[PDB]
Amino acid sequence: AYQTIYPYTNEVLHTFDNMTDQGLADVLERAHLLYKKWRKEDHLEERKAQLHQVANILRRDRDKYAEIMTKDMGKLFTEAQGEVDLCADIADYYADKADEFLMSTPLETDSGQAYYLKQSTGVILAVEPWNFPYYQIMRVFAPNFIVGNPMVLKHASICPRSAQSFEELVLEAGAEAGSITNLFISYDQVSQVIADKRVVGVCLTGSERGGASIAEEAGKNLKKTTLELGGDDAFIILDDADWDQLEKVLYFSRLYNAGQVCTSSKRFIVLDKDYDRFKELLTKVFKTAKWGDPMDPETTLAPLSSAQAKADVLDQIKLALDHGAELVYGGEAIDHPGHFVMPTIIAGLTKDNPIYYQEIFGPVGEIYKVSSEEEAIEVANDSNYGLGGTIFSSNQEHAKAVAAKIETGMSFINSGWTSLPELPFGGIKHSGYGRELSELGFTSFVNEHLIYIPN
Amino acid sequence: AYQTIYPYTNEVLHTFDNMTDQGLADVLERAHLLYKKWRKEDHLEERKAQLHQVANILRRDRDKYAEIMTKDMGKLFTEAQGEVDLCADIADYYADKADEFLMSTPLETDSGQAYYLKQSTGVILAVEPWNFPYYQIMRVFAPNFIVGNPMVLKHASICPRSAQSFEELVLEAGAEAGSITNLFISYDQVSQVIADKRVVGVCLTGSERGGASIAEEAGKNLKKTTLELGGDDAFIILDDADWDQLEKVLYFSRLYNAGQVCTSSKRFIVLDKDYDRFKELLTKVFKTAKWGDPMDPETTLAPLSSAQAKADVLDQIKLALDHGAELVYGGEAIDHPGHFVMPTIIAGLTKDNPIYYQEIFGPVGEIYKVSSEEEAIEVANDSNYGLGGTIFSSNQEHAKAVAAKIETGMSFINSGWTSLPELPFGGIKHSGYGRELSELGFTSFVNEHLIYIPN
């Protein structure tokens, strides 16, 4: 069921009715007709103006949109405002790069004249998670809206108000009905949408289980897909790391959004000589956390998104300890109605311990000890994920060399994760395939139409 | 079973045994280790020199490789020689472009420095068809080899000698064992390969059925894929078409490789005023066909690839006629042990006729009649396929404007299909997704690894 249940009080705020089969059919036909309209007639200029208007409205009513996310999945109101700003940046970026990104591409050949057009393909289905209600949508809506692919959205069950308000936001900006439509549907209906001839692609962000189910259904129907899955990013601290700068990013690196970030710095990798120093520094940092009302500007740690999320993180901590891990800090239950989990630090992780290979979507620092840089690289790559990662070193060329050896899609030098409109986002292995954002994400669902005239 | 049965005499020449579970396991491990070796050490220059050597050997022994394709699937020896020459060009092209294509790409950002590397990902599984034994393989092997992705191949059951000899060719070029390995496996074993963690991607060229099976399996395992499926390309003749130039390309457009080409000109779309004239012309061109021994340089029409192929084409022709189509030329059996089908032409096709929407992988010309350019476009787009197509017009500007309105991946002006290393190849709808060749095909299974350094 689609419901808004405030993670801070655990009170049901809204309950939405699921979309009917007839409604779904009407939505797909409307989207398909809109696709044909944009395919036969050039309406790019209008879409550009509309996307800029989406950005204007977000600026103006930022606090309202920020509060909706907080009440939906519990993130700090201040973090929610930051999320809105990034959405404004993404919307404006694609509106500005439109003409450039859609330009035809000349091809070098001495046999004749050749180039390819970048054309739209059809209706795109987007399946998104709750950790960044607006950002997850905008990452794919903005580029596809500009190319001309109408979109249908299946958002997470716990952030229906965010999903619904995004659709209303685009309609308010003046976009034609059908540009994007939220779908309060079940898993079976999602299968029907993917099997619908009017839908030409699927982009999903979420868990491996959901990804495997959606990709399997898409493959059976010959629909292209892009998958953005979990991560268990390695944060590697080399011997020449600047610890003054290190202390400044630690809180953000693992406790931002209460650790519910695919690119969170889940696995800290430190050298023997810095091991004790780091355990003490991370503990000092985690101790500054102040949990409570996410709407209060003083709160610096939000409650997890749901009761189930809290239960899973707590069980993972228990599992780690039961298999030999060492409890460095926290691990103490928080007495409060909200889904709170206190910052916790575990170490003494070994390959025979299950948690060594598991992603923990919570405020849990994990410390891995290595004796050399080569050992650091080995541990970083001994993972089923390959999304992000950080290399901390005062020597830029050194950091760049080590980063290249990490089997992952993204490497952040001397900093936790960052996402910007101009930077491609995506990974490898179980983190998925394909990319979102930049010009790379822009063409995921565009048809490169070759035009060839031989001499 | 994997067997070489000469289409001209229907004589079984070779019978190969299937690879075992252990053999498959040994191959995957070897390929996986080779991937690691190339990822840890720089062996690009050697791979470049080795790819050039593959081209040199193909050049030197062109006739032996050509005859192998002729004996496997029956194409004209002269055509087979042409395929080899294209393979030589594809090989030389990626060897020469290697450095340029692998260069790191700078990303413009005002927040700091950013760029992304083009790194290898792992072992790639290629599934190929018999229509172009060597070209189908080279299209994907050349780019992935340069990238550093070892490859495993599952080729068609009727062209095992081609598959086996291609592996021997790469070995003879000095490439390390495992660079590419042919696999005489079953469909079940193909599923195991896709589910093996050492395999990170799958590129298939073939029928919709095979495509859906492999893509569905890949999706379930979170593996990225590219699909090059069939086509039912429209060959549109506009009002200002140069009929002298038209007559020169017609034979090739539909009878090349006996019509067994995905980008064959299967649907001729002509205006009322030109209808009768085109019927006469196509009939005149088709009458020049000389079927017989494909090794004979006198032959201009080869037998189909198998008895089943022949049976399917003949049934499609019968189906068309039973539903209202008109027989304009041919349609009579050829008495000979070979799998021969004489050039046939049908017209009077209506949307109510099943064949109107079916691809015919044989020497069957189909004529659609329209009254205007708008109708020509509607017919061309009223298809489940969208691979290639042709626009015939003396006014290039006009031809290009019309081509842009066709929903397909490629448009050839005043000529039938053509494939070059520098040109991207692929389509939309049931024709698949993704592109081969060019730079686009080069990055299908590349990990664009982002390196970001904030100010």
- Find, among B255, B274, B284, B238, the residue nearest to B380 by Cα: B238
In the stretch 185-244 of chain A, residues with CB closer than 8 A to chain B read: 200-201, 208, 211-212, 214-225, 227, 229
The chain B residue lying nearest A210, using CA atoms, is B220
At residue A119, φ and ψ (nearest 5 deg) are -115, 160
- Tell me the two tokens of residue A322: 């039961």
Q: Angle of helix B160-172 relative to helix B62-73, nearest 10 degrees?
A: 160
CB B406 within 8 A of CB B381: yes
Which chain B residues are within 8 Å of A223, Cβ to Cβ?
433
Report the residue of chain A nearest B114, measured CA to CA.
A423
User: Which of A291, A309, A311, A312 is CA-nearest to residue A300?
Assistant: A291
Q: Are A146 and A100 spatial neighbours (Cβ–Cβ below 8 Å)?
A: no
A41 CB near a chain B CB, below 8 Å? no
Instruction: Give yes or no: residues A353 and A441 share one domain.
Output: no
Q: Among all residues of chain A, which has the CA nearest to that of B400?
A: A451
Position A97, amino acid = K
| Cα B148 from chain centre | 23
Give the closest-approach CA distance of B5 to chain A in angstroms. 32
Q: Are A431 and A387 found together in one domain?
A: no
- A87 is known as an active-site residue: no
**Sign of the CA dihedral B314, B316, B322, B325?**
negative
End-to-end CA distance of chain A: 62
List all residues 6 or more positions away from A25 whose beta carbon is below 8 Å from its beta carbon.
none
Q: Which of B200, B211, B396 is facing A453, going by the closest CB pair?
A: B396
CA A259 to chain centre: 13
Closest residue by Cα to residue A407 from A392, A425, A429: A429
| Cβ contact B291:B302 at 8 Å | yes
Does the active-site annotation cover B262? Answer: yes
Contact B330/A at CB under 8 A:
no
- Gyration radius from chain A CA atoms: 23
Residues B293 and B304 in one domain: yes
Q: Do A449 and B411 touch (CB under 8 A)?
A: yes
On whether the CB atoms of residues B436 and B424 are closer than 8 A, the answer is: yes
∠ CA B104-A105-A203, nearest 5°, is 70
DSSP assignments along A80-145, one per residue? HHHHHHHHHHHHHHHHHHHHHHHS-EE---SSEEEEEEEE---EEEEE--SSSTTHHHHHHHHHHH
**Alpha carbon distance B181, B163 (integer Å):** 9
Query: What is the Cα–Cα distance from A300 to A288, expressed in whole angstroms?
Result: 9
Q: How far apart are CA A358 and CA A317, in angstroms?
A: 11
Chain B contact present for A357, CB below 8 A = no
Contact A37, A47 (CB under 8 A): no
Relative to beta strand A326-329, strand A344-347 is antiparallel
Select which of A167, A217, A262, A366 is catalytic. Answer: A262
CB neighbours (10 Å) of residue B286? Answer: 23
Q: Do residues A271 and A370 touch, judged by C-beta distance below 8 A?
A: yes
Same structural domain, B193 and B276:
no
Q: Considering the candidates A128, A228, A359, A436, report the single residue annotated as catalytic.
A: A228
Using CA atoms, how far residue B192 sits from A214, A219, B24, B164, in Å, is 20, 17, 10, 21
Q: Are residues A240 and A225 in the same domain?
A: no
In a shared domain, residues A251 and A356: yes
* Closest to A106 in 3D by CA, of B96, B421, B423: B423
Q: In whole angstroms, what is the distance from residue B140 CA to residue A394 CA?
A: 41
Q: What is the Cα–Cα distance from A110 to A253, expressed in whole angstroms?
A: 52
The rounded Cα B66 to chain-centroid distance in angstroms is 17
Q: Are residues A106 and A192 in the same domain?
A: yes
Method of determination is X-ray
**Please, which residues bridge with residue A201 across strands?**
A124, A224
Among A404, A435, A450, the residue with its CB nearest the CB of B448 is A435
**In whole angstroms, what is the distance from residue A362 CA to residue A24 CA?**
35
Which residues does chain B have within 8 Å of residue A40's beta carbon, measured at their own beta carbons? Answer: 405
Nearest to A109 among B217, B422, B425 (CB): B422
Of A426, A429, A406, A400, the C-alpha closest to A269 is A406
Q: Identify the three-state secondary structure at position A90.
A: helix
H or E stretch covering B389: none
Identify the residue whose tokens are 């990902």.
Answer: B121
Question: Is residue A103 within 8 angstroms of chain B, CB to CB?
Answer: no
What residue numbers bound the domain in which A251 lies? 231-420
Are A338 and A8 a contacting pair, CB within 8 Å?
yes
Look at the alpha carbons of B271, B276, B281, B286 in this order and tell me if their dihedral is positive or negative.
Answer: positive
Paired tokens of A154: 């299946």
Closest Cα to residue B442, out of B39, B124, B82? Answer: B124
- What CA–CA distance (Å, rounded) separates A28 from B103? 42
Is A453 an interface residue toward B (CB < 8 Å)?
A: yes
Q: Which residue of chain A is at minimal alpha-carbon distance from B228?
A: A222
Sheet bearing B447-454, strands edge to edge: A326-329, A344-347, A364-370, A267-271, A234-237, A390-392, A410-413, B447-454, B112-119, B105-106
Do B412 and B428 belong to one domain? Answer: no
- What resolution in angstroms does the PDB record give? 2.1
Rounded to the nearest angstrom, the minimum Cα separation between B325 and chain A is 28
Please name the residues between 287 and 316 in chain A that touch chain B, using a CB distance below 8 Å: none
Tokens 């709160």 sit on residue? A299
- State CA A22 to chain mean position distance: 31
Long-range contacts of B243-246, Cβ-Cβ distance < 8 Å, separation of 24 or more: B243/B277, B243/B281, B245/B392, B245/B414, B246/B281, B246/B392
Looking at the structure, tell me whether residues B24 and B61 fall in a common domain: yes
Domain match, B265 and B202 both: no
How crowded is residue B41: how many other Cβ atoms within 10 Å of its Cβ?
8
Residues B245 and B287 in one domain: yes
Q: Do the chains contact at A424 and B450, CB–CB below 8 Å? A: yes
CATH number, domain containing residue A30: 3.40.605.10
**Residues B442, B140: Cα–Cα separation, whole Å:** 8
CATH number of the structural domain spanning residue A261:
3.40.309.10
Measured between its terminal Cα atoms, the distance across chain B in Å is 61
Give the dihedral sign, CA B367/B372/B376/B378: negative
- CA A103 – CA A116 distance, rounded (Å): 9
Residue A251 sits in the same domain as residue A174: no
Total domains present in chain B: 2
